[PDB]
């Protein structure tokens, strides 16, 4: 019954603080990590994903993020390693690395940019797994990648015993339900924070999110209350969170989330160029959001 | 009447020449209210093959539907058309028949500006004096209506709500919050449970013609907090919905009703009749879910 | 004998009054302007440009009849009868055939997600009932409907599907179609890309802006085919200034405003299209003086 | 200080089984583009070179090998665009120190960057390298569209000297052409070379020119000579080639055409799959029919 359900829970998609030269701030990274567990009371980190600006880093920076995040948390804390890269050699090297550190599972975004064939995408996942022997979590983000995965295609992927589930962000709830019903034996972690409540009643096993770095407590309440049948209160907390998410998005989500962390005393530094620093023309509105929701 | 609740998007049976089978139409209407226990009918919508009809057929449908059902049945008339004159004329005829509100698809095909789209709704309201329900269906029309555009529409005291089909639950949420006193009726049968926990006041659907009981149970159980059960029922409804789409929805839905002894006739060309090659699979569905 | 349908057509504009009723005398002036002033080979009638999809059946007939009575017997006349209502499409196709239009045309059925087999048989039904030649009208940007080459060949296999009014913005698809169907009429419908369309082997063009810019359009088409490509292109530069400007202002109302400045009773657009905005007038007059419209 | 008009090969790269660069093979591909295909230049480490699959050393190696493989009459453009701005700067410097005539960069993708962010990514690379820059716009792969307004702001930088244009819109191309008469426009859709030519492009960069450049130049010359019907006939032929190679997996197949000439074409880098032998006969017919 609990087969493949080990990595259930709520996960922060770890944010990364940089210095003026795109270099990782290690003490700040350590702080954001500890904030996700200790303050936001979350189950795990999903490390070197979209939110950690992973795709702007060189190979050594990524390793560095994999190392500091595991150092900064206790053994009870679930850890997923996003090692997806267009460079399959890099992703294997990062895969072996993350595995040897004790990350409980790997994840990889679907290959993008090039119009890869399904067969090509499938064997990208098969090759990472072959070389690393770790469990693998599909990361489907069609809004950034342009890549869509039919139900027939998940069936082919989920047919590998080491492809354990999916970080699901397509916004389609007909698809999510088909998937949920077709593959009950597989983990589905949802990736759209602003739709947590809908994903919960669609039977997701949990969620991964950028905004759970600042709003992990409301997010837990949303997930737990919906699973309890307290729909109305879950939805009201989803209103609050959607105020939050909509505001962060209109200011540049990763810098803004990082400014919210700064305000708690964290050294959240800067985003990596070409991402721009938080624009001060947004500061007041950001402070109102913070006061109002006590972030 | 307050317009809350569950509506069949009324299907229409046609003969070989694409003419309305009045007697089968009466039967389809009575099936929705009496057998499927629905609150009302949404008449001349997408599911009634409305956009294939001429003006007289439209009137004929409005008349036969209204005459077929109890006085206390909620009735919404989709009068939306690319021909504004036609829509005004149809809005008047249905209002005079006693339809409780009007509904109109966002003008489509031509790339109308928002202002143009706005005053089409306002011209319709002005000529008819009936309440109006926006029919938003971007998958069919290519027209999206942003939150600010909903604000301006909803500022009109006679635009009392939306039949919402955009597959976007972040926007559904924002609209639900920004407009707590407007009517929201969801249009995606396959996502009724997600729409319900999102605070819609009801739902309009083509598959409620055959599966309105299950639909009611999703809406009620989800709101009473029996969410696991609501969701299981959605799993079941989505087998039904998936099969039917794969077979051509309107004719397949009509084949299901024909099975109950209803004279569900034919789809209007250029839709093709139900393909016999699907019948076994359809029979298995009907048998499995007692349709 | 049948006319060679090759050539340059106005997508005919229609003037209305305050109530969305056809202004017949203006419509006549518009049809005469296209042929006598703009010097075009023919009329494509009740197309997108005639605000056709806004009309009732009686109105579409009216427009078919006025357009035909307005031009000489030499003038090529194509009737757009595409409609979601197949019965109406057939009644219109027969009415235009009886008027003596040289070909029918029909937009691909839209709104509903029709099947390709369904789109095909809508066309075959129209032909069966009218016995006229049929021109497919591909406007994927308004319909959201696309036709692949295999779908075009299944369509073009009908001997009475004589061609396509092609408005997809894909010059790879167009080349393939040009290649695969040398025996079929391809008329391009993207006025702003007439030069590229000519050099790709189109048999002519249908277009709304030819109502005011037909002289330049003909020179683009002639010069491009004579290999005077640099001058051809310069006239497309100038033509696209005009297209872009009227686009920005609401194309059908603005084109009818230009017709108005020639003394034509171009009336109003049919609502929900709004009338030409006075705030654009100055710019339009400058455009009119600079390109002598 | 060359003007950069003309026909470029987007240079393909041959790999071994472990995704490593086959150098000897690379040299043959550069020389085939220049010597056999009679082209003005190479666009190096672009989409066609499986660039975005490579690590940083690999991109250097390609830049270095391609450059050593050709003479000084040969115009060279270094595509250094990268989600990693540090890396993009690093490569830009390296290419510029090797003598590349200009740099090029794909618009930052994956993340939904704002325009200001896209603009300053280009400005920083210029700042750091001081070479000329060529915008690589490829909306079909990136989902990034550049408006005429955004081109004007970009082209306002004296070092942004042009654009490799692969958008499929000829109204926009014509607009661009008219508004920026002083800038370089190199079209990137091989299947639309003729239409781009008569639309006033200064030349073209393409993957199929590795095997069909001779035929390409004739499209480009004939259409300018106004030998339009002939140019277009050669576009027909070319598009039979393009369509056939696309249906088989463009980069591997193109490299298999090169093998028939005795080039050590190697393999593509995974997750790209090697040319599938089920296509062999059809490819051989194509090579035979179009004399490749």
Give me the catalytic one of B163, B182, B254, B268.
Answer: B163
| H helix or E strand, kind and range, residue A124 | helix A118-132
Ramachandran region of residue B225, left (φ > 0), alpha (ψ -120 to 50) or beta? left
Q: What distance in Å separates the CA atoms of residue A40 and residue A33, rounded to the nearest whole number?
A: 10
CA distances from residue C186 to A242, C2, C43, C203, D170 in whole angstroms, order as listed: 51, 17, 16, 5, 18
Q: Which residues of D touch A86 (CB under 8 A)?
A: 52-53
Q: What distance in Å separates the CA atoms of residue A169 and residue A150, rounded to the nearest whole number?
A: 14
Which residue from A97, A14, A83, A19 is spatially nearest to A55, judged by alpha carbons?
A: A83
- Please give, rounded to a whole number of angstroms, the shortest distance from the CA of D80 to a CA of chain A: 14
D113 touches chain A (CB under 8 A): yes
Write out chain D in H/E/C secondary structure: CCCCCEEEEECCCCECCCCCECHHHHHHHHHHHHHHCCCCEEEECCHHHCHHHCCHHHHHHHHHHHHHHCCCCCEEEEECCCCCHHHHHHHHHHHHHHCCCEEEEECCCCCCCCHHHHHHHHHHHHHHHCCCEEEEECHHHHCCCCCHHHHHHHHCCCCEEEEEECCCCHHHHHHHHHHCCCCEEEECCHHHHHHHHHCCCCEEEECCHHHHHHHHHHHHHHHHCCCHHHHHHHHHHHHHHHHHHHHHCHHHHHHHHHHHCCCCCCECCCCCCCCCHHHHHHHHHHHHHHCC
SS3 content of chain B, % helix, strand, coil (to 5): 55, 15, 35
The answer to whether the beta carbons of residues C233 and D199 sit under 8 Å apart is: yes
Q: Which residues of C touch B268 (CB under 8 A)?
A: 86
The answer to whether the beta carbons of residues C9 and C187 sit under 8 Å apart is: yes
CB contact under 8 A, C121 and B55: no
CB contact under 8 A, C240 and D189: no
Give me the catalytic one of C137, C166, C184, C210.
Answer: C137
The answer to whether the beta carbons of residues D186 and D165 sit under 8 Å apart is: yes
Residue A262 tokens read as 């700064």
Burial zone of A118 (CB within 10 Å; 0-12 exposed, 13-18 middle, 19+ buried): middle
CB contact under 8 A, C56 and B140: no
Residue D135 tokens read as 């915008």
Task: Give yes or no: B163 in active site.
Answer: yes
Q: Is the peptide bond before B32 cis (omega within 30 degrees of 0)?
A: no
Interface of C with D in 213-252 (CB under 8 A): 224-229, 232-233, 236-237, 240, 243-244
| φ, ψ (nearest 5 deg) of residue A143 | -65, -25
Residue B232 tokens read as 């299981």
Give me the catalytic one of C165, C184, C256, C270.
Answer: C165
- At C140, is the secondary structure helix, strand, or coil? helix
A56 touches chain D (CB under 8 A): yes
Chain centre distance of CA C221: 16
C80 touches chain D (CB under 8 A): no
Residue A8 tokens read as 């259930």
Q: Which residues of C touch D231 (CB under 8 A)?
A: 199
When divided into structural domains, chain C yields a total of 1
Interface of D with A in 19-38 (CB under 8 A): 19
The answer to whether the beta carbons of residues A179 and A188 sit under 8 Å apart is: yes
- Return the biggest CA–CA distance within chain D: 51
Ramachandran region of residue B45, left (φ > 0), alpha (ψ -120 to 50) or beta? beta
Q: What distance in Å separates the CA atoms of residue B109 and residue B83, rounded to the nearest whole number?
A: 12
- At B67, is the secondary structure helix, strand, or coil? helix
Which residue from D39, D57, D51 is spatially nearest to D13, judged by alpha carbons?
A: D51
> Is B237 within any annotated ligand binding site?
no
Burial zone of D247 (CB within 10 Å; 0-12 exposed, 13-18 middle, 19+ buried): exposed
Chains in contact with C, where contact means 3 or more Cβ–Cβ distances below 8 Å, are B, D
Which residues constitute the domain of residue B281?
Answer: 1-291
Closest chain D residue to the Cα of C197, Cα to Cα = D195
- Please give, rounded to a whole number of angstroms, the shortest distance from the CA of B9 to a CA of chain A: 20
Which residue from D205, D252, D246, D287 is spatially nearest to D13, judged by alpha carbons?
A: D252
Strand partners, D78: D44, D103
Burial zone of A115 (CB within 10 Å; 0-12 exposed, 13-18 middle, 19+ buried): middle
The answer to whether the beta carbons of residues B56 and B22 sit under 8 Å apart is: no
C170-188 b/e (C-beta count within 10 Å ≥ 16 → b) = bbbbbbbbbbebeebbbbb
CA distances from residue B42 to A181, B26, C189 in whole angstroms, order as listed: 31, 14, 39
Angle between helices B22-30 and B249-258 (to 10 degrees): 80
Long-range contacts of D188-192 (CB under 8 A, 24+ apart): D188/D10, D188/D138, D188/D164, D189/C172, D190/D216, D190/D238, D190/D242, D191/C171, D191/C172, D191/C175, D191/D238, D191/D239, D191/D242, D191/D243, D192/C171, D192/C172, D192/C175, D192/D168
Burial zone of A265 (CB within 10 Å; 0-12 exposed, 13-18 middle, 19+ buried): exposed
> Is B190 within any annotated ligand binding site?
yes
> Is B186 within any annotated ligand binding site?
no
CB contact under 8 A, C171 and D175: no
- Mutation for B interface: C52, C110, C111, most B CBs within 10 A: C111
The answer to whether the beta carbons of residues A244 and A295 sit under 8 Å apart is: yes
- At B74, is the secondary structure helix, strand, or coil? strand
CA distances from residue A272 to A17, A21, A22, B3, B14 in whole angstroms, order as listed: 8, 8, 5, 52, 63
C144 touches chain D (CB under 8 A): no
CB-nearest to A127 from D113, D117, D270 is D270
The count of other CB atoms within 10 Å of the CB of residue C129 is 16
CB-nearest to C111 from B53, B108, B119 is B108
CA distances from residue B252 to B6, B283, C85, C116, C139 in whole angstroms, order as listed: 21, 11, 21, 18, 30
Q: Are strands D102-106 and D133-137 parallel, antiparallel or unpaired?
A: parallel
The DSSP letter of residue C41 is S
- Resolution in Å equals 2.3
> Is C191 within any annotated ligand binding site?
yes
Strand partners, B7: B40, B204
Q: What distance in Å separates the CA atoms of residue D200 and residue D119, rounded to the nearest whole number?
A: 26
Task: Give yes or no: C165 in active site.
Answer: yes
Which residue from B286, B88, A125, A36 is spatially nearest to D270, judged by alpha carbons?
A: A125
Give me the catalytic one of D27, D60, D164, D269.
Answer: D164
Which residue from D180, D218, D212 is spatially nearest to D197, judged by alpha carbons?
A: D218
Long-range contacts of C33-36 (CB under 8 A, 24+ apart): C33/C211, C33/C259, C33/C262, C33/C264, C34/C10, C34/C210, C34/C211, C34/C214, C35/C10, C35/C70, C35/C71, C35/C72, C35/C75
Which residue from B215, B8, A274 is spatially nearest to D109, judged by alpha carbons?
A: A274
Closest chain C residue to the Cα of B246, Cα to Cα = C115
Give me the catalytic one of D43, D122, D136, D165.
Answer: D136
CATH number at residue B33: 3.20.20.70
Q: What distance in Å separates the CA atoms of residue C154 and residue C115, rounded to the nearest whole number?
A: 14
The answer to whether the beta carbons of residues C66 and C59 sit under 8 Å apart is: no
Q: What distance in Å separates the CA atoms of residue C275 and residue C257, rounded to the nearest whole number?
A: 10
The DSSP letter of residue B31 is I
A282 touches chain B (CB under 8 A): no
Closest chain D residue to the Cα of C226, Cα to Cα = D226
CB-nearest to A242 from B168, B174, B225 is B174
Question: Can chain C be said to touch chain D, i.e. do they have 3 or more Cβ pairs within 8 angstroms?
Answer: yes
A198 touches chain B (CB under 8 A): yes
């Amino acid at each position: 019954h609990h087969h493949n359900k080990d990595l259930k829970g709520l996960y922060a998609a770890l944010l990364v603080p940089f210095d003026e030269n795109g270099q990782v701030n290690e003490q700040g990274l350590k702080q954001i990590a500890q904030n996700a567990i200790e303050t936001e009371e979350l189950d795990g980190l999903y490390v070197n994903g979209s939110s950690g600006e992973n795709f702007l880093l060189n190979t050594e920076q990524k390793k560095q993020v994999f190392k500091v995040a595991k150092e900064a948390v206790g053994d009870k804390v679930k850890l997923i390693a996003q090692v997806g890269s267009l460079d399959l050699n890099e992703a294997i090297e990062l895969g072996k690395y993350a595995t040897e550190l004790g990350y409980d599972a790997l994840s990889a975004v679907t290959p993008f940019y090039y119009p890869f064939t399904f067969e090509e995408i499938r064997d990208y996942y098969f090759d990472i797994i072959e070389a690393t022997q770790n469990n693998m979590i599909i990361y489907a983000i069609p809004d950034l990648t342009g890549v869509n995965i039919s139900i027939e295609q998940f069936s082919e992927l989920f047919n590998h015993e080491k492809i354990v589930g999916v970080k699901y962000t397509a916004p389609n709830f007909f698809l999510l339900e088909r998937i949920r019903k077709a593959f009950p034996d597989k983990l589905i972690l949802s990736g759209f924070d602003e739709m947590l409540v809908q994903a919960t009643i669609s039977g997701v096993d949990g969620a991964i999110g950028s905004t759970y770095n600042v709003n992990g407590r409301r997010a837990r309440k949303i997930f737990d209350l919906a699973r309890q049948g307290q729909i109305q209160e879950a939805y009201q907390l989803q209103h609050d969170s959607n105020d939050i998410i909509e505001t962060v998005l209109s200011m540049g989500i990763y810098p803004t989330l990082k400014e919210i962390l700064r305000h708690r005393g964290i050294d959240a530094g800067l985003p990596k160029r070409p991402f721009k620093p938080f624009n001060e023309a947004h500061r007041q509105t950001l402070d109102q959001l913070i006061a109002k929701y006590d972030l």
